[PDB]
Symmetry: none
Subunit: 46 residues, 35 copies
């Protein structure tokens, strides 16, 4: 069993598409907000 | 999840239309008034 | 357990809606005031 | 402890009501005076 | 004993709720203050 | 598999064209507005 | 008994699905929080 | 010893009440003065 | 007596279930803690 | 004597409760201080 | 019987193809995961 | 009686199939575990 | 049989070309992403 | 050493009493003069 | 006397229960400690 | 075979010229952009 | 790939010619107007 | 000797009280000065 | 081969002369422009 | 590339000769007019 | 003499209590110091 | 090679004499002009 | 050597008394001048 | 090298004596003229 | 018959060429694999 | 000889008091300087 | 050889006196200039 | 026959030149790759 | 033959001069590049 | 041969003087430049 | 003579007390040093 | 000869004093340098 | 002949002085290099 | 014939000088190589 | 003659005191060295 460990490269990688997103990916709703958060202060700052 | 963070550009931006207005936008009622406020003093100043 | 860490993206994000607000969000009562604070000085300044 | 940092928005904000006043707020006694100060010179200026 | 190490995930995690708070969590009383601290200087700065 | 990791340089980079835009790119509608936001206050300021 | 040690590959592997999760897996509730923990400080930091 | 690091949140925080004041806090005697300092120049400026 | 030494495979193996746990198994209470121990330092580190 | 090595799991583990604390645990008095140490510099930095 | 022990080289070797896989081979499902496990922590770590 | 000692080669060999397994063979349930035992420590170690 | 073990150097090595790739190689799709993942946060960070 | 940084608030502040005066303070001899300077031109201007 | 040497299997075996323990068995008090010994260095190492 | 492992230094190194480029190298199209990305915000910021 | 990142200096720079213009450049139609805006008020002011 | 490493938590910690002060602690004489340093420039800046 | 790694100091360094320029170096055409960009707004601002 | 950024001083400066003129320079046709504009009112005012 | 080798388990074990301490045990005075050593550099690092 | 990095202080510094001039230095031809630019408007303004 | 790093707080601090002065301190001869520089223009401006 | 940065206070300051003059200093020939410029208009204005 | 036993040295030796190979010789297909087996774990381990 | 290896704990530990100092300890003369080094740049930076 | 590594603390430290100066130290000729550079623009700015 | 066994030293040794290479020798193509494998991850890691 | 094995120390050692170089030695062309690789990102990062 | 391995301390150490320089040492020509690189952007930034 | 061989157990055992020490026992002076040797490198490593 | 092997403990140990130094001991001249090497980059890094 | 075998202890031992050196002894030229080899990578790694 | 068997001690012994070498003696060319073989893997391993 | 063979026990035994030493006894000079030989490699290995 050697073809096994390669086909597996498919096993980390499918676990990763959304995952890589968890900090960066759902967060864009709150994170752009860090940007949106800027405007929060400038209307105040202008 | 990568299409996520772009679609999100829609999330800061919709939070911004009125917001950008808060200092400049409701204030035009009181701010033009800073202008209107000028006349306040000139009828007095003329 | 891999579906776990994604469903979790729901765990930072729900902690964030008000939170992101704490500096920008309650503060708009005092912060616009930084703007309102402007007028404080102009009636004096005009 | 996450509800903590929001309830706290109450902690900057209560520190701010008078505070925001310190430069603008007690000063209106002396500052309007900057205005009152105008008249000081005009009776002289008229 | 293998079910042991998983049930344990409960052992770090219960040690963490307040803990994660210690720097961010009690500190919001002093930290928002870093924000509140801003106003400290602006009434002075305006 | 070594030609793989280079061809991949194509994988971050295609994820980036719009992305790099998200803060700077959709925002130019609201951001120029930060500029447009200037005029907001000057007609008031002039 | 030689088919034994292979069928066994099933014995480490079933012990692993949740297990691999214990540090990474339950922790995403507290760990994303390390991320969520970021926001903790920025509303303060902005 | 885990209850230790939380009870400690009490250790940074008690070190902070006056401390946060050092730049903003004693300074209000000299800093409002930056404001008071304004008047210094206006009686001269009026 | 030859069936003896096989039936015995049952004798090491029953001695092993908890045993294998001793370093890894009770320790997950203290070990996850090595993980929990991380958070110990980050609230401090953030 | 085989029940011995398991009962022993009790021997590392009781040696560990405070111990795990030594770097993280007494140190929270000085370590939060690394955090408290932050404020040290900001009142200076603000 | 001497050709016997060589033909036998076929007897260890056929017992080995999957076997060699047992730790490395089924495990790639959980092991790449040790890699996949990395990403677990970075979305959190980024 | 000389054909006897050869036919006997059948007598050690049938005693051996499971036997050879006793240390390696039942143990794969606990031994892979030595491998599974690895993961025990890494979720802790990661 | 001695030429055997050398010709075999061909047997590990052919098992290795893709294999060496499994962590580094398929992953460049997700890994550059760790890089691509950077941009995820900067449009937010800029 | 934590009482140190507060007692120090005494160190900027004592450096400030005259200092704050340097532009506004010695200058009142020349600055009122900017006022006195007015009269310079009016006896000429009347 | 032939039943003698078998009944005797009882004579090595009863000498062995604790004995097998001597290196592994009392030592678990000091040996887990080799494990406990790990923590000794990590609180220092973390 | 010893001259082999040196001639091989040629084998990592030829795999590296473009590779080293993958994060830094294709990315300069998107990365300078991080710089170009600056200007994105300043025309807005000026 | 090293000549790549330099040739790229061409990639930010071509993105910049008009861009640098966006706030300053289209705006001269409205901005000179800030100047033109002056005259707006002087015919009124003269 | 296990009570040793805990009692020792007393050994880093006593080395730390002043130490933590060295950059933040003696420096408040020069650092507030960074603040005091501000005033240096404003009497000049007002 | 030890004289190799030093002679190589010549290999990063020759890759650097223009490179260091890429952000600062081609950009001076657009960057001074950030300065030139100032004038853009002042003729408007004067 | 270091001689680059100096030769560039030529790039802002050539963009400036007419530019500096835009508000002051074309405007002298309309601006002297602000002066010419005086006469507009005096023939009326005399 | 068979009870001998067990009673002896008492002979390694009594040699071990302090001994196990020698690297970990006296060293906590210098080792926590490796931790204390951290602070050495941070007051410098902050 | 340690005398190297000091002799080098000569390498940034020689790159700096004109350079520091680029914004301030060639620009004095156009910048004093910002001053000269004043007069542009006053002959108009007087 | 631990008393060393504290006694050293004396080493940055003695390097600082004049130093802190270099920008603010010798410059008061030229900087008040920025103030003195004001008068330069007002006798002209009055 | 620490006495260096102080002796240097001599390096900005010698660059400043005439420099501070450039706008205020050569200009007094043209600037008093702004005053002289007054008379230009009054002989006309009287 | 004495030349017999020497000519026979040919009889063990011809039985040995492949034979010596059986453990080392066919096994290089599976054994290098023990080496190849290394890589199995490192792509996972890197 | 067993009391030997413990008494020896005295042999690493006496080698350590100054030693632990070498990087952290003499260096505080140059390292605080890294801090002192800060001020180097701020008088320049203020 | 143990007295060696301490006496050596003398070897980094003597390499450091000027070195620490290289960025901060020769640069004060050009850096104060960053300050001197200020005046460059103000005579222009006043 | 005694000169035989020495001349034979030639028989293991000629079997060894390539052989010693099999794990280390062909593998340098894949092994340097373990090194080359590093770069795989750093372009990703940088 | 005993002088043989020493003269041989010459046999590993001559195989080593370049060899030791293979990872460190040819690689300095690509490795300094890991350093050169830094600059890759900073011109982008500055 | 034991005096050999010490005299050798001379063999790593002579390989190190320039070597240690390769990243830090030739690079000071390009690295101070990272500092020199600062000025690149400030004349632009001032 | 049979009591002889037992009384003799006293003859190996008295030869052993120091002896067992020779590698472990005198060596603790140099061996802890292997530990002490650690610190050798960390002050360097920290 | 039994007193021989103990007196010998003197033979490894005298071979060790400098020896233990070879990697750690002469190297402190180059190794502290790894520390000194830090400063190499920070004057550049500050 | 019995004095023979002792005098002989002189025969292994004289064969050993250099010999023991062959792996450790000539190799220190290449081996310290394994240490020297470290630096190879750090100038690259720093 | 009795002097015969002693003179013969010369007959095994002369057959032995090279012979003893055959495994250890020619092999040092390939065996040191087992050592040299180490380096084979470390340049790869470093 | 029977007392003869016992008195003789004195004849093997006196031949043995040094003899037993020959392999173990003179060799401790070279053998501890096998231990001393360890250190040979670790200063290299650390």
């Amino acid at each position: 069993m050697d073809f096994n460990p390669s086909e597996v490269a498919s096993q980390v990688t499918n676990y990763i598409q959304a995952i890589a997103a968890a900090g960066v990916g759902v967060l864009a709703l709150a994170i752009g907000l860090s940007a949106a958060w800027k405007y929060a202060k400038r209307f105040l700052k202008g």
